[PDB]
From a paper:
FlgA is a periplasmic flagellar protein that chaperones P-ring formation. FlgA possesses a typical signal sequence at its N-terminus, recognized by the Sec-dependent pathway, suggesting that FlgA functions as a P-ring assembly chaperone in the periplasm. P-ring formation is a key step enabling the bacterial flagellum to pass through the outer membrane. FlgA can be divided into three domains, denominated as D1 (residues 1–74), D2 (residues 75–142), and D3 (residues 143–198).
Residue numbers in the entry: 1 to 198
Write the structure that this text describes.
């Protein structure tokens, strides 16, 4: 109830915009947790957001890996009308439906900005959750294009220009050759800009 409410609140904050109702519960053994009253929580390399995830509880020098369960509820993209192979996901064939995110199939599309100019790999029936393995996104960024690189670090923000070295869809990884000749990589946002965390 103290660790849970800490986790419930910690995840509720991390899953802002995705879910407005998050309930976390510790699953691992309570005798392995770090001795601090309130520990800093680190995500485990973006392995998962909800369901049964792993969190790094840190106490100055002592590090413990915990297992938790995140019960999130938010919006996801559902097939609203039947869709055919190589069919374009449109406002007519798809819609935003509220449901339990931790009960959704993996790589389910949550944000409508992921599926601008997306096409279906297979036939889809109404109500099915749109998964990124079931679609082909159009390339947001093309190799050879000049792109803006945005690096938000701790205490600072960097804004730079580079050249895209590969074709990449939104939320996919893009490699960029900086003006200085260095090669850096990040993820493509809806804007076509390249975001780098640290």
């Amino acid at each position: 109830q103290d660790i849970n409410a800490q986790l419930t609140t910690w995840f509720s904050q991390r899953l802002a915009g995705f879910s407005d109702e998050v309930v976390v519960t510790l699953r691992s053994s309570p005798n392995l947790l770090p001795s601090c009253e309130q520990p800093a929580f680190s995500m485990t390399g973006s392995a998962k957001l909800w369901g049964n995830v792993n969190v790094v509880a840190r106490c100055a020098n002592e590090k413990r890996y915990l297992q938790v369960n995140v019960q999130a509820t938010g919006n996801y993209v559902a097939v609203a009308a039947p869709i055919a192979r190589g069919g374009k996901l449109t406002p007519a064939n798809v819609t935003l439906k509220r449901g339990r995110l931790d009960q959704l199939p993996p790589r389910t599309v949550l944000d409508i900005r992921q599926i601008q100019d997306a096409v279906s790999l297979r036939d889809l029936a109404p109500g099915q959750p749109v998964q990124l393995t079931m679609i082909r996104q159009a390339w947001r960024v093309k190799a050879g294009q000049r792109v803006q690189v945005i690096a938000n670090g701790e205490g600072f923000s960097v804004n730079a220009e580079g050249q895209a070295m590969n074709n990449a869809a939104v939320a996919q990884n893009a490699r960029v050759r900086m003006t200085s000749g260095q090669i850096v990589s990040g993820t493509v946002d809806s804007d076509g800009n390249i975001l780098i965390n640290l």
